[PDB]
Write a protein that holds these residues in place. Structure first.
Motif, PDB file in Angstrom:
ATOM      1  N   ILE A  86      31.252  50.989 116.061  1.00  0.00           N
ATOM      2  CA  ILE A  86      30.183  50.107 115.608  1.00  0.00           C
ATOM      3  C   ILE A  86      30.361  48.792 116.342  1.00  0.00           C
ATOM      4  O   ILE A  86      31.478  48.268 116.409  1.00  0.00           O
ATOM      5  CB  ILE A  86      30.217  49.889 114.088  1.00  0.00           C
ATOM      6  CG1 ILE A  86      29.973  51.208 113.356  1.00  0.00           C
ATOM      7  CG2 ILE A  86      29.175  48.822 113.694  1.00  0.00           C
ATOM      8  CD1 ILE A  86      30.224  51.138 111.876  1.00  0.00           C
ATOM      9  N   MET A 119      31.784  36.878 115.804  1.00  0.00           N
ATOM     10  CA  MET A 119      31.835  35.627 115.064  1.00  0.00           C
ATOM     11  C   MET A 119      33.127  34.919 115.440  1.00  0.00           C
ATOM     12  O   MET A 119      34.218  35.345 115.041  1.00  0.00           O
ATOM     13  CB  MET A 119      31.744  35.905 113.569  1.00  0.00           C
ATOM     14  CG  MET A 119      30.450  36.667 113.248  1.00  0.00           C
ATOM     15  SD  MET A 119      28.930  35.697 113.456  1.00  0.00           S
ATOM     16  CE  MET A 119      29.042  34.644 111.989  1.00  0.00           C
ATOM     17  N   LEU A 179      31.686  35.701 107.543  1.00  0.00           N
ATOM     18  CA  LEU A 179      32.149  35.402 108.894  1.00  0.00           C
ATOM     19  C   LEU A 179      31.471  34.130 109.391  1.00  0.00           C
ATOM     20  O   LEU A 179      30.340  33.823 109.001  1.00  0.00           O
ATOM     21  CB  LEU A 179      31.858  36.559 109.855  1.00  0.00           C
ATOM     22  CG  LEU A 179      32.705  37.804 109.572  1.00  0.00           C
ATOM     23  CD1 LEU A 179      32.165  39.024 110.336  1.00  0.00           C
ATOM     24  CD2 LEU A 179      34.155  37.531 109.964  1.00  0.00           C
ATOM     25  N   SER A 202      29.006  39.757 105.476  1.00  0.00           N
ATOM     26  CA  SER A 202      29.417  40.999 106.134  1.00  0.00           C
ATOM     27  C   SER A 202      30.007  41.922 105.084  1.00  0.00           C
ATOM     28  O   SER A 202      29.991  41.604 103.896  1.00  0.00           O
ATOM     29  CB  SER A 202      30.414  40.738 107.267  1.00  0.00           C
ATOM     30  OG  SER A 202      31.623  40.236 106.775  1.00  0.00           O
ATOM     31  N   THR A 220      28.973  44.834 116.831  1.00  0.00           N
ATOM     32  CA  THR A 220      28.220  43.733 116.247  1.00  0.00           C
ATOM     33  C   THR A 220      28.376  42.482 117.093  1.00  0.00           C
ATOM     34  O   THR A 220      29.224  42.407 117.986  1.00  0.00           O
ATOM     35  CB  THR A 220      28.675  43.395 114.819  1.00  0.00           C
ATOM     36  OG1 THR A 220      29.968  42.773 114.855  1.00  0.00           O
ATOM     37  CG2 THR A 220      28.738  44.649 113.963  1.00  0.00           C
ATOM     38  N   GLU A 221      27.564  41.475 116.773  1.00  0.00           N
ATOM     39  CA  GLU A 221      27.819  40.145 117.302  1.00  0.00           C
ATOM     40  C   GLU A 221      29.244  39.733 116.965  1.00  0.00           C
ATOM     41  O   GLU A 221      29.838  40.209 115.995  1.00  0.00           O
ATOM     42  CB  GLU A 221      26.820  39.133 116.734  1.00  0.00           C
ATOM     43  CG  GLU A 221      26.929  38.911 115.230  1.00  0.00           C
ATOM     44  CD  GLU A 221      25.904  37.911 114.713  1.00  0.00           C
ATOM     45  OE1 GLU A 221      25.616  36.923 115.423  1.00  0.00           O
ATOM     46  OE2 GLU A 221      25.373  38.122 113.615  1.00  0.00           O
ATOM     47  N   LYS A 251      40.088  32.344 105.483  1.00  0.00           N
ATOM     48  CA  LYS A 251      41.168  31.913 106.368  1.00  0.00           C
ATOM     49  C   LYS A 251      40.769  30.684 107.180  1.00  0.00           C
ATOM     50  O   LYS A 251      41.586  29.779 107.408  1.00  0.00           O
ATOM     51  CB  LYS A 251      41.547  33.062 107.292  1.00  0.00           C
ATOM     52  CG  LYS A 251      42.859  32.869 108.024  1.00  0.00           C
ATOM     53  CD  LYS A 251      43.297  34.207 108.598  1.00  0.00           C
ATOM     54  CE  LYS A 251      44.686  34.161 109.210  1.00  0.00           C
ATOM     55  NZ  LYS A 251      44.714  33.443 110.510  1.00  0.00           N
ATOM     56  N   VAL A 281      39.600  46.903 114.600  1.00  0.00           N
ATOM     57  CA  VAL A 281      38.515  46.020 114.998  1.00  0.00           C
ATOM     58  C   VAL A 281      38.977  45.275 116.239  1.00  0.00           C
ATOM     59  O   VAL A 281      40.098  44.751 116.275  1.00  0.00           O
ATOM     60  CB  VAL A 281      38.121  45.045 113.875  1.00  0.00           C
ATOM     61  CG1 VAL A 281      36.990  44.132 114.338  1.00  0.00           C
ATOM     62  CG2 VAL A 281      37.715  45.817 112.619  1.00  0.00           C
ATOM     63  N   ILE A 286      41.448  42.507 116.734  1.00  0.00           N
ATOM     64  CA  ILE A 286      41.187  41.499 115.715  1.00  0.00           C
ATOM     65  C   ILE A 286      41.716  41.936 114.356  1.00  0.00           C
ATOM     66  O   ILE A 286      42.032  41.093 113.511  1.00  0.00           O
ATOM     67  CB  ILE A 286      39.683  41.203 115.600  1.00  0.00           C
ATOM     68  CG1 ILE A 286      38.999  41.079 116.948  1.00  0.00           C
ATOM     69  CG2 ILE A 286      39.487  39.946 114.878  1.00  0.00           C
ATOM     70  CD1 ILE A 286      37.552  40.624 116.800  1.00  0.00           C
ATOM     71  N   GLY A 327      35.932  33.740 112.754  1.00  0.00           N
ATOM     72  CA  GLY A 327      36.548  34.699 111.852  1.00  0.00           C
ATOM     73  C   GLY A 327      36.107  34.553 110.404  1.00  0.00           C
ATOM     74  O   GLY A 327      35.011  34.068 110.078  1.00  0.00           O
ATOM     75  N   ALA A 341      32.078  42.212 118.612  1.00  0.00           N
ATOM     76  CA  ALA A 341      33.134  42.843 117.842  1.00  0.00           C
ATOM     77  C   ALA A 341      32.890  44.345 117.813  1.00  0.00           C
ATOM     78  O   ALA A 341      31.742  44.795 117.780  1.00  0.00           O
ATOM     79  CB  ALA A 341      33.190  42.292 116.422  1.00  0.00           C
ATOM     80  N   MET A 354      23.439  48.003 108.004  1.00  0.00           N
ATOM     81  CA  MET A 354      23.305  46.795 108.813  1.00  0.00           C
ATOM     82  C   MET A 354      22.084  46.859 109.724  1.00  0.00           C
ATOM     83  O   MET A 354      21.438  45.837 109.980  1.00  0.00           O
ATOM     84  CB  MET A 354      24.574  46.577 109.643  1.00  0.00           C
ATOM     85  CG  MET A 354      25.790  46.206 108.835  1.00  0.00           C
ATOM     86  SD  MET A 354      27.242  46.012 109.893  1.00  0.00           S
ATOM     87  CE  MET A 354      26.601  44.929 111.161  1.00  0.00           C
TER      88      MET A 354
HETATM   89  C1  LIG Z   1      31.243  43.050 110.032  1.00  0.00           C
HETATM   90  C2  LIG Z   1      31.406  44.200 110.863  1.00  0.00           C
HETATM   91  C3  LIG Z   1      31.131  45.455 110.350  1.00  0.00           C
HETATM   92  C4  LIG Z   1      31.256  46.634 111.067  1.00  0.00           C
HETATM   93  C5  LIG Z   1      31.682  46.589 112.380  1.00  0.00           C
HETATM   94  C6  LIG Z   1      31.984  45.364 112.916  1.00  0.00           C
HETATM   95 CL1  LIG Z   1      32.525  45.358 114.448  1.00  0.00          CL
HETATM   96  C7  LIG Z   1      31.872  44.177 112.191  1.00  0.00           C
HETATM   97  N1  LIG Z   1      32.157  42.997 112.802  1.00  0.00           N
HETATM   98  C8  LIG Z   1      33.290  42.331 112.577  1.00  0.00           C
HETATM   99  O1  LIG Z   1      34.131  42.762 111.870  1.00  0.00           O
HETATM  100  C9  LIG Z   1      33.510  41.094 113.158  1.00  0.00           C
HETATM  101  C10 LIG Z   1      32.710  40.237 113.789  1.00  0.00           C
HETATM  102  N2  LIG Z   1      33.250  39.107 114.231  1.00  0.00           N
HETATM  103  C11 LIG Z   1      34.499  38.957 113.938  1.00  0.00           C
HETATM  104  N3  LIG Z   1      35.171  37.902 114.270  1.00  0.00           N
HETATM  105  C12 LIG Z   1      36.413  37.683 113.945  1.00  0.00           C
HETATM  106  C13 LIG Z   1      37.095  36.915 114.799  1.00  0.00           C
HETATM  107  C14 LIG Z   1      38.389  36.538 114.637  1.00  0.00           C
HETATM  108  C15 LIG Z   1      39.021  36.991 113.543  1.00  0.00           C
HETATM  109  C16 LIG Z   1      38.412  37.783 112.603  1.00  0.00           C
HETATM  110  C17 LIG Z   1      39.153  38.211 111.499  1.00  0.00           C
HETATM  111  O2  LIG Z   1      38.705  38.381 110.409  1.00  0.00           O
HETATM  112  N4  LIG Z   1      40.382  38.475 111.810  1.00  0.00           N
HETATM  113  C18 LIG Z   1      41.619  38.727 111.129  1.00  0.00           C
HETATM  114  C19 LIG Z   1      42.151  37.414 110.745  1.00  0.00           C
HETATM  115  C20 LIG Z   1      43.556  37.625 111.048  1.00  0.00           C
HETATM  116  C21 LIG Z   1      44.083  38.586 110.047  1.00  0.00           C
HETATM  117  C22 LIG Z   1      44.093  37.937 108.694  1.00  0.00           C
HETATM  118  O3  LIG Z   1      45.371  38.819 110.531  1.00  0.00           O
HETATM  119  C23 LIG Z   1      43.226  39.852 109.868  1.00  0.00           C
HETATM  120  C24 LIG Z   1      41.679  39.601 109.990  1.00  0.00           C
HETATM  121  C25 LIG Z   1      37.093  38.132 112.820  1.00  0.00           C
HETATM  122  S1  LIG Z   1      35.001  40.315 113.091  1.00  0.00           S
END
Ligand SMILES: Cc1cccc(Cl)c1NC(=O)c1cnc(Nc2cccc(C(=O)N[C@H]3CC[C@](C)(O)CC3)c2)s1
Length: 285
Positions: A81, A86, A137, A147, A83-84, A93, A23, A15, A89, A35, A58
């Motif tokens: 780490i 999302m 998110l 987040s 997480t749920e 965006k 990620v 991701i 995203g 994630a 968290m």
């Molecule tokens: C918030 C958090 C903190 C610590 C550890 C973790 Cl694992 C997390 N969890 C996450 O980051 C996430 C939870 N759910 C997520 N869903 C998600 C799904 C689809 C896209 C994205 C996202 O932001 N993706 C990209 C969007 C495409 C780009 C701009 O190329 C880079 C970032 C996030 S990310």
């Protein structure tokens, strides 16, 4: 924190990717989508403390509008780490890719969810410092969750945060935080006002092409972001009050949640729109 065995975790799709980890979207052991954020071998002590410190913060929270921690892998490498997941995203965006697709009531409901998460954080004595749509998110119920948690890692890791003449995301940051590094829940309220403007514009870049120095000069001279198109008067009034120079005059998050809840409960209140000042004149005989 729940310690999860690596054999329960299946990384499926990248991701996001950084220097020191990635990620992933994956599955956790019915199997549940998660994630997964990794920290690769060779990490420093500071990187470890920052990385696990985000999970530690968290893990102290339990709120509908705050990203939920499933667990950590710390006994094995790479550390993780979990997480749920999302599904939609990052909010900035997401809105840019769904321009004009939602009702005003849906947009305001997104803001109420964000405000409830921020009210929780502020009452838990947690100052975010980097509140912006890029750090919200969105899931498949359109629920918005705050987040990006931690101490120094939050602003160090954000590319929008730039070194000033501190390393701060200038367009989202309150004057007192820019000027003398005073980050409080009231500077988070300023940021929330910017997030309100991001949501109602479907993700326009605040202050458009103005440079960082130009933004700071404009704010100091009293200018504020203009009304978005199709914006309820009450919503523009609220974001304007988030941008009061005097910190003590800004609403608290409790006030913001209350107002947004009353507007949603009486949805005709949102049909009164603030005037929009056009940049283009189209004249036809
Ligand atoms: C918030 C958090 C903190 C610590 C550890 C973790 Cl694992 C997390 N969890 C996450 O980051 C996430 C939870 N759910 C997520 N869903 C998600 C799904 C689809 C896209 C994205 C996202 O932001 N993706 C990209 C969007 C495409 C780009 C701009 O190329 C880079 C970032 C996030 S990310």
């Amino acid at each position: 924190t729940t310690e999860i065995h690596p054999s329960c975790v299946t990384r499926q799709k990248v991701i996001g990717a950084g220097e020191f980890g990635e990620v992933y979207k994956g599955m956790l052991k019915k199997e549940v989508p998660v994630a997964i954020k990794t920290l690769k071998a060779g990490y420093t002590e500071k990187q470890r403390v920052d990385f696990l410190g985000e999970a530690g913060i968290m893990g102290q929270f339990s709120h509908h509008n705050i990203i939920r921690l499933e667990g950590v892998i710390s006994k094995y490498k790479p550390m993780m780490i979990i997480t749920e997941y999302m599904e939609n995203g990052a909010l900035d965006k997401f809105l840019r890719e769904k321009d004009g697709e939602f009702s005003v009531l849906q947009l305001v409901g997104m803001l109420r969810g964000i405000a409830a998460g921020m009210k929780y954080l502020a009452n838990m004595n947690y100052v975010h410092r980097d509140l912006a749509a890029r750090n919200i998110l969105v899931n498949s119920n359109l629920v918005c969750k705050v987040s990006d948690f931690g101490l120094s890692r939050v602003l160090e890791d954000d590319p929008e945060a730039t070194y000033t003449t501190g390393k701060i995301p200038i367009r989202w940051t309150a004057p007192e935080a820019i000027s003398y590094r005073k980050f409080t829940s009231a500077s988070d309220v300023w940021s929330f006002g910017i997030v309100m403007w991001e949501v109602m514009t479907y993700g326009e870049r605040p202050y458009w092409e103005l440079s960082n120095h130009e933004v700071m000069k404009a704010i100091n001279d009293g200018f504020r972001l203009p009304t978005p198109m199709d914006c309820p008067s009450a919503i523009y009034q609220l974001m304007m009050q988030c941008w009061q120079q005097e910190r003590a005059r800004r609403p608290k998050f409790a006030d913001i949640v209350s107002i947004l809840d009353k507007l949603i409960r009486a949805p005709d209140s949102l049909k009164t729109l603030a005037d929009f000042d056009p940049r283009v004149s189209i004249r036809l005989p």
